[PDB]
Write a structure and sequence with these properties.
Chain lengths: 438, 50, 100, 57, 62, 438
């Protein structure tokens, strides 16, 4: 119907999907057993879940996702936890070795012998589905093993299906914190692969997630549990359009047609406004005006860049809860007329609005509040250039001093692609600044 | 009183100076308008008179 | 050591030479509040437009405004460039002191 | 106040169309016939035709 | 071929503008006359001084 | 609509606002809970409270003020106090360092990292505002810390808001009591940095406040409870015209128009006439004649400036309670017939009346009597030339001996600015001279 198919890769990107389903079960009342109550929702599988679960004749919800990973540890843990019945067993595919952050080792030594199995799984789901608008890919640019493997998977998908769009997410390289030194290498490789086959790619950074958490959620010692809970809320908001209905409805096809102006550059940034602590929301006030002011406030954006230096291209926004077009238009007119917000003359307007009536739902034991006016903001800007500005000037030094080149050549790759990667990146910066120039 | 008001360029308080530089140029035209209005009005006056 | 003492006075004068010109930018670029700006008879003053009336050419005020803003920006850039050199030279001298 | 403006304008014998133009009463003379100033030729013709018609009047 | 040509971006100019000498309906024919009399401009049947938060020269879209 | 915003800087500037909101909450039925009696007065915030409390849907009156400071002691105290649940959670902004009374330190060393946050607070209040007539800035000239931040933030809010009014109350230097050696220095800096942006400034001499206190309130040991309560009543009087009705109503715009003759010199003085105690009120009578004469008494002023030394030019009478224009104008005629009073040849009339029917208030545990006829005497007079003369002939000595300047030069400023300040003060004083000449 209006359904998608999901792929998670990496001990980076598996627990995030785990949290995603921990959220997605409640709003359909999916008991961890997997079976619906005495309510007569079961049948062929037709109800709001019909976009994520194939509740086929067994009366059980089966997610339409696959977890591919190269280390049995975390996958065996999660399949021995509580949700093992909920997950499909061999929709969980696991290897026994890693790539040790090496893109090329994982792209040439291990990839050739599990791709057949995973393509078999995706075909066996694609047959039983009917519409299949697209896919939900999760990996990491700091991919210790997900990076190259996912690049090859995405190549094979691009060459097998050419009749739909793909959504890419990435926990981005932390600009000034680096947990890995193989990070610049695998990041540059993954980028200059993705740019020409990634349909719509999104970046987030976790340092600024920490910053959000201790600015307004005020929690001084959170964990991944909280971080991934926030990210799952984000993706839930972006697909609420498919989930429920409303006054006007939007779709990822419109997302593409209305966010990307031209070829290549298709790399927006997300933001979520109404994150707040319990007592704060308890005895303070919420409405469209202040939530919009906060969403455009420069420091709430979870990627370290300055909109004041930047200039915007386009802006899609999703309002979830209870809202009316009168306040909508008033507030958006004020924000249009605001002064600091620089808008390019190539766009007279840039605003794509969405309204949906279902309030977001909190996970039991969660950390955010009981909000009634949620909003996700998806903006395209020229403020993204700073990341590449930093990355190129790291890469040129570390690659002109060429450490670890022995490591990479020890398995069959060498510096040709290292040259064309930085050159593709250079083309990227020049086009960014050129289109930024009016 | 050492004079210094020749050209330089920085203008810390300039909006209001230019706003009042609009004042004489807006007034002069009104003065001309009232002059010609006077002559045409009196012409009309004794025309209708006879 | 004496030169290091000399340096700070010029440092202070040059640093003060930035705040007031950012202030000047702010005070020549309106309030950045359209909402209460009109109380100062928004640019296009009702009297000014009604003056226009038959029009026949208009005010050069926008041109002069842009002229001033541009000059401010140019001198901003020059001062920032020199500023960035300053501290590095200062601290290289300091490390030379330490080695001595 | 049209009356006071015209009398304080200087020239007393305004010609008033009818009255002869007294050569010394003319003080402040109008700006030249131009399309932009407050002396468009559309009125420049009209004052003349009205004056001569009132002459035959 | 002619192309539009505005000025740079500011924050003090309003998005729209009226041009009362072309927006007054009663004195329309007379002001049409002195438009040519001054020889200033009519040009395109459609222009505006303030298209959006910016301005252009007197020569309308040419 | 009709509302303003309150700004409080400096641990001097904190307990004053504390007592002010005490009086405010007492008078508008506000309880330490923050919710009214069972009477229906709760809504979107549209009634008498709407000028200083935004009692939003949470039912809690949320004050439209901000308290900032550099040292956490007093702010944590008022967090531990009784009213903290009323006070907004992070409307209390606190640094962790002092300023050594050094205006230069508080303007350059530390101010560059707090002005941004406070600007964010100010904008998020002004947006929910609708009318935004003005602010109420409370700092102190002899401020132990509130000098540099007050200066800088006042400058920046000027450059971001170019039209609205600014009201600035300060404590003046004590002409014969010096609790701070560099206070004259801080004073001259504040003056020549603020006069060109400050809109309406009032001063007050706490020595003369105490003098009034033991003159007619006949207690030989008053305290800050009393000293703050009096000025709180004063501000209640000045905002009464907005809070209640009257035969004629005046506004701060009228204040600035008819109270300042010329640009530059914009420094009026206040006085409260019926500063009388329980027993004297209880067995002595009240009426317009004696209240007027009392307010025009040459000694009950809170600033040492003898009118006979000075000369008047402006007077604003504000009568609150029950009162009649008949004897109002009769009494003002009598005062004009009095010859001691000296109104310059420039102003034949300089008098503005303002009437409110509503009578002012007592407070539980109050030190004041039961007032029925109340008056603010707000007058502008030339009597403050000596005030600047005393401080200039103080300051010139310390500069000619250049004492203590090593602190300032170490923190990072220079001396041509002091030179400009000294000549500015000389210019102001000579201007006082010519305007004194008739
Ligand atoms: N996507 C995702 N990334 C995470 C998460 N937690 C941390 N990260 C970051 O993502 C990176 C994980 O990538 P890798 O370590 O290369 O994972 P991998 O390629 O699957 O293989 P390994 O080398 O065995 O981990 C780390 O550098 C972390 O900084 C998470 O929960 N999800
Ligand atoms: N506003 C106010 N001022 C007071 C009060 N009590 C005393 N003062 C006077 O206000 C001045 C306080 O200045 P400071 O002590 O420097 O206050 P500050 O600059 O904010 O910083 P600190 O020195 O850290 O307190 C003193 O000179 C007192 O004479 C009061 O309760 N309220």
């Amino acid at each position: 119907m209006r359904e998608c198919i999901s792929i998670h890769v990496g001990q980076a990107g598996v627990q995030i999907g785990n949290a995603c389903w921990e959220l997605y079960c409640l709003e359909h009342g999916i008991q961890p057993d997997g079976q619906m109550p005495s309510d007569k929702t079961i049948g062929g599988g037709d109800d709001s879940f019909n976009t994520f679960f194939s509740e086929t004749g067994a009366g059980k919800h089966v997610p339409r996702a696959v977890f591919v990973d190269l280390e049995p540890t975390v996958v065996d843990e999660v399949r021995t936890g509580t949700y093992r019945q909920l997950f499909h067993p061999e929709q969980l595919i696991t290897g026994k070795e890693d790539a040790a952050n090496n893109y090329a080792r994982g792209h040439y030594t291990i990839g050739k012998e599990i791709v057949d199995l995973v393509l078999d799984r995706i075909r066996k789901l694609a047959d039983l589905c009917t519409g299949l608008q697209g896919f939900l890919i999760f990996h990491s640019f700091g991919g210790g093993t997900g990076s190259g493997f996912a690049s090859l998977l995405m190549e094979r998908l691009s060459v097998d299906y050419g009749k739909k769009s793909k959504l890419e997410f990435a926990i981005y390289p932390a600009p000034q914190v680096s947990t890995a030194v193989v990070e610049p290498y695998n990041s540059i490789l993954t980028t200059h692969t993705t740019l020409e086959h990634s349909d719509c790619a999104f970046m987030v950074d976790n340092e600024a997630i920490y910053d959000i958490c201790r600015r307004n959620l005020d929690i001084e010692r959170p964990t991944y549990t909280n971080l991934n809970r926030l990210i799952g809320q984000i993706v839930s908001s972006i697909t609420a359009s498919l989930r429920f209905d409303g006054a006007l409805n939007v779709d990822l096809t419109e997302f593409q047609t209305n966010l990307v102006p031209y070829p290549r550059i298709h790399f927006p940034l997300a933001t979520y406004a109404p994150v707040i602590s319990a007592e704060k929301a308890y005895h303070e006030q919420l409405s469209v005006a202040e939530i919009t002011n906060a969403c455009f406030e420069p420091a709430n954006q979870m990627v370290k860049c300055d909109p004041r230096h930047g200039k915007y291209m386009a802006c899609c926004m999703l309002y979830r809860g209870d809202v009316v077009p009168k306040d909508v238009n008033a507030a958006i007119a004020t924000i249009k007329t605001k002064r600091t917000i620089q808008f390019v003359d190539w766009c007279p307007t840039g605003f794509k609005v969405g309204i949906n009536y279902q309030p977001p739902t909190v996970v039991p034991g969660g950390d955010l509040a009981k909000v009634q006016r949620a909003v996700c903001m998806l903006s395209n800007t020229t403020a993204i250039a700073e990341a590449w500005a930093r990355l190129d000037h790291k890469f040129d030094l570390m690659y002109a001093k060429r450490a670890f080149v022995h490591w990479y050549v020890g398995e069959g790759m060498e510096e040709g692609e290292f040259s064309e990667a930085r050159e593709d990146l250079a083309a990227l910066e020049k086009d960014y600044e050129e289109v930024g120039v009016d | 009183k050492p004079p210094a008001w020749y050209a330089r360029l920085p203008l810390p308080m300039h909006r209001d100076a230019r706003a009042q530089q609009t004042a004489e140029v807006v007034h002069a035209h009104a003065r001309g308008a009232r002059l010609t209005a006077a002559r045409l009005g009196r012409a009309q006056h004794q025309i209708n008179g006879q | 050591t004496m030169t290091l003492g000399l340096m700070r006075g010029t440092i202070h004068r040059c640093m003060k030479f930035n705040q007031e010109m950012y202030v000047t930018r702010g005070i020549i670029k309106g309030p950045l509040l359209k909402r209460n700006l009109e109380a100062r008879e928004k640019l296009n003053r009702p009297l000014v437009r009604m003056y226009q009336r038959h029009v026949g050419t208009q005010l050069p005020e926008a041109t002069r405004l842009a002229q001033g803003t541009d000059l401010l920006t140019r001198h901003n850039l020059h001062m920032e460039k020199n500023l960035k050199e300053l501290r590095t030279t200062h601290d290289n001298l300091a490390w030379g002191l330490n080695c001595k | 106040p049209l009356d006071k403006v015209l009398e304080q304008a200087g020239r007393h014998s305004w010609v008033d169309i009818t009255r002869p133009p007294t050569p010394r009463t003319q003080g402040l003379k109008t700006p030249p016939p131009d399309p932009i100033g407050t002396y468009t030729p559309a009125c420049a013709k009209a004052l003349f035709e009205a004056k001569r018609l009132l002459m035959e009047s | 071929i002619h192309l539009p040509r505005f000025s740079l971006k500011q924050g003090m100019i309003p998005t729209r503008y009226v041009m009362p000498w072309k927006e007054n309906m009663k004195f329309r024919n007379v002001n049409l006359q002195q438009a040519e009399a001054c020889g200033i401009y009519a040009g395109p049947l459609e222009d505006s001084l303030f298209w959006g938060y910016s301005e252009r020269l007197c020569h309308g879209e040419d």
